[PDB]
Subunit: 173 residues, 3 copies
């Protein structure tokens, strides 16, 4: 006990950096599910987020599958197209937003507040994904971490779109 398996049945510590990486993707997936279930976004944002939840499972499958020279069967890996899709969504959803000069106090709607929670969890997942690469520079792909990086940018953008209180700004004083 205290051990479990990767996608290739390889035994691993429940403390393992790869497992912590795709476990945090799970936590991020749940956080996005909470934003959907309690924030009730419009149908278009709902479809975007549901697609991200699908992507996050693709990222966890990538992280749970060691990189090998020639595998038994082709592995599921994140690709740059995943990230370019997030970039496209960022541009579209950020186009109507006014310019931001300072930090925003997270909150507002249930949807915007929960998108902020998901943002911070996703960024925690990203930190874990980079720690997985640091531990296995040759065995772990960096695209999962790069996908999580841009996802937090998108979640921040969507949190602003969804906020009816507008941008409540941080006054350093």
């Amino acid at each position: 006990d205290g051990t479990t398996g990767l996608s290739d049945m390889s035994r691993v510590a429940k403390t393992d950096a790869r497992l912590v990486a795709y476990a945090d993707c799970d936590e991020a997936n749940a956080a996005i599910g909470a934003a959907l279930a309690l924030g009730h976004p419009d149908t278009q944002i709902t479809d975007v987020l549901r697609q991200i939840q699908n992507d996050l499972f693709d990222a966890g499958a990538d992280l749970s599958t060691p990189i090998v020279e020639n595998p038994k069967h082709p592995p599921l890996r994140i690709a740059q197209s995943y990230i370019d899709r997030l970039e496209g969504w960022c541009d579209a959803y950020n186009a109507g937003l006014p310019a931001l000069k300072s930090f925003v106090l997270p909150g507002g709607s249930p949807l915007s507040a929960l998108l902020h929670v998901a943002r911070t969890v996703v960024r925690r997942a990203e930190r874990s994904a980079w720690a997985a690469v640091d531990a296995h520079p040759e065995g772990v792909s960096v695209l999962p971490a790069k996908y999580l990086n841009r996802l937090s940018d998108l979640l921040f953008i969507l949190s602003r779109v969804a906020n009816p209180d507008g941008d409540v700004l941080w006054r350093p004083g």
Copy 2:
């Protein structure tokens, strides 16, 4: 400052593995409290979850109390009966559920979404509980970690029971 006490007044780093373990049990307890307060489960599931919250405090008391040869007064420890009770709940609640072939996108009801959040926090708590044992193989009991392990199985089962959207499945594509 930066130090605190275990159950025996022993001084400990606020970074300590045992403290991180029972602190994550606290976070898991709060997550379950959110599922209750926002998901409004039926009275039967409410009683199950409230009992788990009670168990989690028993687990934290176990984790905060070093194992010693003969203690001043008898310690509160998790027992196999705690875990067998969770196993019994898993079987009962999983009996009516259809067979699952793939991963589920967390979400659906407020209750099912928040049970997914609690699931991922509990699994984070489990990882912390195993790290506590690794650091003190002789001083920390493994039953807290084993209880958290099966609790995440139950929370997954309950999340399916509570979901009115059924199982929204991950399409790897």
Copy 3:
């Protein structure tokens, strides 16, 4: 990739203890935003929490700014006045509360449940803040960690104020 910048443009690992500290302040800020957006506290508690969200950004700016002998421009730092303000709020809000003899099961209202979630995240942020100091005893200030320490005391107090189920107590049995 896998690197980012502190407030002084210094390059840093996305695993860095200082970054993990002010990232957890962000997560705590979001958690408080969720309590506001879903718990709908009265106007007075709303103003207290919004002020704390402002303080947390001040703490993150402190943590992201290395301590130096004579800086280019004066840094934003947490002060004892921040903490004394939290102490004042604790006393006021705890005055009407009955004496507590045991642990409370987190939950109750949406507000009180989410204040418990925020409490546990803030305590996680505190642990991270102390780890930042341990890593840079001379470069990181301890007042951010001390502010987070007392904030968790206040959030516990407010969670009791907000709970309509009163104190649901842990029975170790």
